[PDB]
Design an enzyme around this catalytic site. Structure first.
Site, PDB file in Angstrom:
ATOM      1  N   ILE A 128       0.791  -1.251   0.000  1.00 24.98           N
ATOM      2  CA  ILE A 128       0.000   0.000   0.000  1.00 24.98           C
ATOM      3  C   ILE A 128       0.822   1.300   0.000  1.00 24.98           C
ATOM      4  CG2 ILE A 128      -2.016  -1.145   1.022  1.00 24.98           C
ATOM      5  CD1 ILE A 128      -1.472  -0.035   3.660  1.00 24.98           C
ATOM      6  N   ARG A 182       5.259   3.041  -0.403  1.00 24.00           N
ATOM      7  CA  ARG A 182       6.721   2.976  -0.509  1.00 24.00           C
ATOM      8  C   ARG A 182       7.286   4.184   0.234  1.00 24.00           C
ATOM      9  NH1 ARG A 182       9.187  -1.632  -2.435  1.00 24.00           N
ATOM     10  NH2 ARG A 182       7.769  -1.649  -4.238  1.00 24.00           N
ATOM     11  N   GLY A 183       8.533   4.086   0.688  1.00 23.58           N
ATOM     12  CA  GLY A 183       9.178   5.162   1.458  1.00 23.58           C
ATOM     13  C   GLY A 183      10.694   5.162   1.351  1.00 23.58           C
ATOM     14  N   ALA A 184      11.323   6.172   1.954  1.00 22.89           N
ATOM     15  CA  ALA A 184      12.776   6.374   1.848  1.00 22.89           C
ATOM     16  C   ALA A 184      13.555   5.097   2.150  1.00 22.89           C
ATOM     17  CB  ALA A 184      13.231   7.506   2.773  1.00 22.89           C
ATOM     18  N   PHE A 185      13.313   4.531   3.326  1.00 21.82           N
ATOM     19  CA  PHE A 185      14.037   3.350   3.799  1.00 21.82           C
ATOM     20  C   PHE A 185      13.246   2.031   3.717  1.00 21.82           C
ATOM     21  CE2 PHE A 185      15.985   7.046   5.888  1.00 21.82           C
ATOM     22  CZ  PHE A 185      17.305   6.854   5.506  1.00 21.82           C
ATOM     23  N   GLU A 212       9.095   0.040   2.623  1.00 22.10           N
ATOM     24  CA  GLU A 212       7.734  -0.067   2.072  1.00 22.10           C
ATOM     25  C   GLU A 212       6.724  -0.463   3.141  1.00 22.10           C
ATOM     26  OE1 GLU A 212       9.478  -3.340  -0.275  1.00 22.10           O
ATOM     27  OE2 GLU A 212       7.511  -4.305  -0.072  1.00 22.10           O
ATOM     28  N   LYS A 232       5.024  -2.276   8.249  1.00 27.74           N
ATOM     29  CA  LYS A 232       6.056  -1.399   7.681  1.00 27.74           C
ATOM     30  C   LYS A 232       7.394  -2.092   7.731  1.00 27.74           C
ATOM     31  CE  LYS A 232       7.881   3.257   8.759  1.00 27.74           C
ATOM     32  NZ  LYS A 232       7.291   4.563   9.138  1.00 27.74           N
ATOM     33  N   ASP A 260       8.347  17.155  10.388  1.00 27.24           N
ATOM     34  CA  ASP A 260       8.049  16.804   8.993  1.00 27.24           C
ATOM     35  C   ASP A 260       6.563  16.422   8.858  1.00 27.24           C
ATOM     36  OD1 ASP A 260       9.027  16.608   6.218  1.00 27.24           O
ATOM     37  OD2 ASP A 260       8.757  14.427   6.425  1.00 27.24           O
TER      38      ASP A 260
END
Ligand SMILES: COC(=O)c1ccc(F)c(NC(=O)c2cccc(-c3cc(C(=O)Nc4ccncc4F)ccc3CN)c2)c1
Ligand SMILES: COC(=O)c1ccc(F)c(NC(=O)c2cccc(-c3cc(C(=O)Nc4ccncc4F)ccc3CN)c2)c1
Lengths: 389, 392
Positions: A77, A79-82, A84, A100, A193
C-alpha cells in the site's frame, strides 16, 4: 542485600520499556550469532566454538519468535525512503494489519539508523487516537518490521487529488491535525516533517498521524539542536540544517499553515520546479507567499494561513495552542475541539471488507550487506528493537 | 497459534539448565561489552553507538550482580593448573565458602576452555554427599569464580603425609572413593583423574570428590572416545596413556586403576610407578606386569595385596568390568564398623580438631600477574565463558 539486588535487577528485566528486557537480551544473542557466522571469522577458535554451542538453540529460538512467515501479504500500500508498507493478514489469528518494512541495509548505508526508536516508542506507548498504534515490532537479518493498525481510508495526498476541498472540510482536517500535533508536543516531541503523506484516515475518515522518522525529543527549554524535500519545512528548520541551529514546536505550526494553503488553493504555497527554487521561496516567504486571484478563500482562512506562515518570533502558537484553536476560522455549527473526533467526518470511506485497499494507489517495482572478512557488527544498531505488546 | 510458541520459549528462559536462561543472556550482553570496549574498535560507528547506549545500563547491572568484592578473602588454601582456591566469607551473610578462581587468560592460552562446564554441572546438580556442592558460579573480566562448600578436613595428600595409615583406615577411604566414583559414573561421567589431591574431607572426616576438570561424558554403551591423554602422571591408566597414540576407546574402568594406585600409596607410603622423570613413570606404567612390586619391609595384608593387583591389571581382567558389585564383595572391605548403605553415617578415622569456622590448619600455606593483550580487531576472549554464571 543480595536478595534485594536480585529483586531490583529482575524488575529491570521484566520492565517492557527496559533496554535489558528479555526480548532485547534475546535480540542481543541473535544479533551476535548473525554477525559472527561467516567462514572467514570462523577461522577464529573462540568464534567457531561459540557458534557450535548456540547455533542449535538460535535456530530453535528464531523459529518460536514472531517472523515475516506468520503474515500473508495481501498487497503493498506504500513505498518510502528506507522501505515499504504492506497490507498483511496474520495467519494464525486472521487479523488484518499494516506492516512497515525498514531496510537495515539502507539505514546503515545512507546512515540514519536512530530514527526508528522514537517511532517505535510513540506508536507503542502514545496511547492516543491521533497516533497509529503499533502492536508488534520485530526483525530478521535484512529488515525491521512494525506491525501497525491498518488505516483503510488512505492519506490526504489521495483525498486532495480525488476531491476539491471546500472550507468546511478544511476546518475539520486542520483542527484534527492541530489536535494530533498537540498530542505529540505533549509527549515532549517535535514532529518536524508534517505533511499530507503522513496524515492517514481511519475507518470513519478521522485523522491519525502515521510517520515519525523525523520526530525528535525536546529539551527543558523546548528547543532541539541537531533533511528532506523542503515543501513543508519552515525557514528556521531550513537555516538550522546549515551547521547548528535551535528551533522548537512552532516549526510544526508552519507546516500546518502550508497544509491549510494546499487544501484550499490546490498547490503548495512555495511550489517551484527545483528544490533550490522551493528552498529559495521558503526563505523569501515575506515577499513570495501570495494567493491566486482565482482561488476563492475567505478572510479568516487567509488570515490563519498568513498567521502560520511568518517568522518564528511572531508565529501563531508561540504563546500556545489556545490562540490557534480560538481563531475565528474554526468557528462552526458541526463540531467542537473537545468532541471533534466523535462527530461525522467530511469523507467517510465506503469499503467492502477488512482487506479493502481501494483508497491506496498501486505500487510497482534486492541488494544486501557484503560477506565481511573482519567483524563489522551491522546488526548491533538493531538490538532491543523487538517489542511484543 | 502464537500463544503456544511464546509459552514454549518462556519455558526455555526460566529453566536454569537451559543455555538461553536469563543468567546466560546477561553474560551474552556483558561479554559483548567487554570484548568491544577498546579505543581502536570504537572507530567503527556500529560498535561505538552500541556501547554508547548500553555502557550505563551495563554498569548498573555489574554492580547489582554477585562479585568478588562481596567476599572477604581469609586465606588462600590451594593452587592448581588454571587458578587458585581461597577461603572466603560472604560479607552480607557472614557464611563461609571455598571459592575457586580459574584464569580466563590461562584457559584460552593453554587452550582447554570447556572443561569447566561439566565441573559446574556436577557441583550444581549432583545432589550427592560424595560431591562438593556449588552454591554460586559467576565471572568477571579475568576469572571464572565457583563458590563451593568449604571442606575444612583437608585432602588425602595431607592425611597420608601427616598420619601413617593402617589398613583399617584404608578400607574406609577406599570404600568411600568407590561409592563417590560410582555416583559420578551413575551420572554418566568418567572421572579419569582420581587421586588424593582431589579427595577432600568434610567437617566430620568423610570424603568428598572435589575437582572435575578431567571428567568427561560417556556414550550410550559406557565407553568414551578421546584422542588426548589426561590426568596426573602417577595415577594415569595405561589405556589412557595408550589413547594418546591414536584412537582410544575405554569405559569407566580407568577410574578403578586409579583407585588401585591410590590404595598402594596409602599402605606402602609411595606411588607404585614412581620415577625421577615423567618419561620414566610412563615407561613403568606401560610395563606394569613386571614393574609393579612391593618392598619386603612392608606389612600389607594378602587381601590388601589381592585388591591392588585386581585393580592394576589390563581392562580385560580388571576388577570393575562387572560393575561396582564385584568391588564391594572383596574380602578386604569386609569388617564390623560399617556397611555400604551406612558408611558415611559411621565414625570416621580422622575427625579434625576445628576451633573456628575459618580454621585452615589442615591446609598448608602458599607463596608466590599477566592478562590479555589489547586487541586491534575483534578477538572475542569472553565468548567461551558466556553462560557460566549460575545462582542457586
Ligand atoms: C525523506 O527524509 C525523511 O524525512 C525521512 C527520514 C527517515 C525516514 F524513516 C523516513 N520515512 C521512511 O523511511 C518510510 C519508510 C516506509 C514507509 C513510510 C511511510 C509509512 C506510512 C504508513 O505507515 N502508512 C500506513 C499506516 C497505517 N495503515 C496504513 C498505512 F498505509 C505512511 C507514510 C510513509 C511515508 N512517510 C516511511 C523519512
Ligand atoms: C593436571 O591437569 C589436569 O588434570 C587439570 C585440567 C584442568 C583443570 F582445571 C585442572 N584443575 C585446576 O586447574 C585447578 C585449579 C585450582 C584449584 C584446583 C583444585 C581444587 C580443589 C578444591 O576445590 N578443594 C576444595 C574444595 C572444597 N573446599 C575446600 C577445598 F580446598 C582440590 C584440588 C585441586 C587440584 N586438582 C584445581 C586440572
Amino acid at each position: 542485600a543480595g536478595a534485594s539486588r536480585q529483586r531490583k535487577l529482575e524488575a529491570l528485566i521484566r520492565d517492557p520499556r527496559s533496554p535489558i528486557n528479555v526480548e532485547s537480551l534475546l535480540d542481543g544473542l541473535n544479533s551476535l550469532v548473525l554477525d559472527l557466522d561467516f567462514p572467514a571469522l570462523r577461522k577464529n577458535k573462540n568464534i567457531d566454538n561459540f557458534l557450535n554451542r548456540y547455533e542449535k538453540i538460535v535456530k530453535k529460538i528464531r523459529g518460536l519468535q514472531m517472523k515475516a512467515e506468520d503474515y500473508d501479504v495481501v498487497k503493498v500500500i506504500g513505498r518510502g525512503a528506507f522501505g515499504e508498507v504492506q497490507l498483511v493478514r496474520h495467519k494464525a489469528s486472521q487479523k488484518v494489519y499494516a506492516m512497515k518494512l525498514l531496510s537495515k541495509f539502507e539505514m546503515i548505508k545512507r546512515s540514519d539508523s536512530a530514527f526508528f526508536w522514537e517511532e517505535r516508542d510513540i506508536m507503542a506507548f502514545a496511547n492516543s487516537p491521533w497516533v497509529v498504534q503499533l502492536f508488534y515490532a520485530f526483525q530478521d537479518d535484512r529488515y525491521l518490521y512494525m506491525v501497525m493498525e491498518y488505516m483503510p481510508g488512505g492519506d490526504l495526498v489521495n483525498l486532495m487529488s480525488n476531491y476539491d476541498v471546500p472550507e468546511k472540510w478544511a476546518k475539520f482536517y486542520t483542527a484534527e491535525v492541530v489536535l494530533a500535533l498537540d498530542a505529540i508536543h505533549s509527549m515532549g516531541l517535535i514532529h518536524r516533517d508534517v505533511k499530507p503523506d503522513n496524515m492517514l484516515l481511519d475507518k470513519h475518515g478521522h485523522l491519525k498521524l502515521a510517520d515519525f522518522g523525523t520526530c525528535m525529543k525536546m529539551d527543558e527549554t523546548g528547543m532541539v539542536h541537531c533533511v528532506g524535500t523542503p515543501d513543508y519545512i519552515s525557514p528556521e528548520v531550513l537555516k538550522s540544517q546549515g551547521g547548528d541551529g535551535f528551533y522548537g514546536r512552532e516549526c510544526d505550526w508552519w507546516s500546518v499553515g502550508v497544509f491549510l494553503y494546499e487544501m484550499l488553493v490546490g498547490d503548495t504555497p512555495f511550489y517551484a520546479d527545483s528544490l533550490v527554487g522551493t528552498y529559495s521561496k521558503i526563505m523569501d516567504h515575506k515577499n513570495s507567499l501570495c494567493f491566486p486571484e482565482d482561488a476563492e478563500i475567505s478572510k479568516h482562512a487567509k488570515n490563519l494561513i498568513c498567521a502560520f506562515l511568518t517568522d518564528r518570533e511572531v508565529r501563531l502558537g508561540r504563546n500556545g495552542v489556545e490562540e490557534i484553536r480560538q481563531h475565528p476560522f474554526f468557528k462552526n455549527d458541526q463540531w467542537h475541539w473537545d468532541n471533534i473526533r466523535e462527530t461525522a467526518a467530511p469523507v467517510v470511506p465506503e469499503l467492502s471488507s477488512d482487506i479493502d485497499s481501494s483508497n491506496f494507489d498501486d505500487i510497482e517495482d534486492v541488494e544486501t550487506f557484503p560477506i565481511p572478512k573482519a567483524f563489522v557488527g551491522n546488526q548491533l544498531p538493531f538490538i532491543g528493537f523487538t517489542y511484543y505488546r
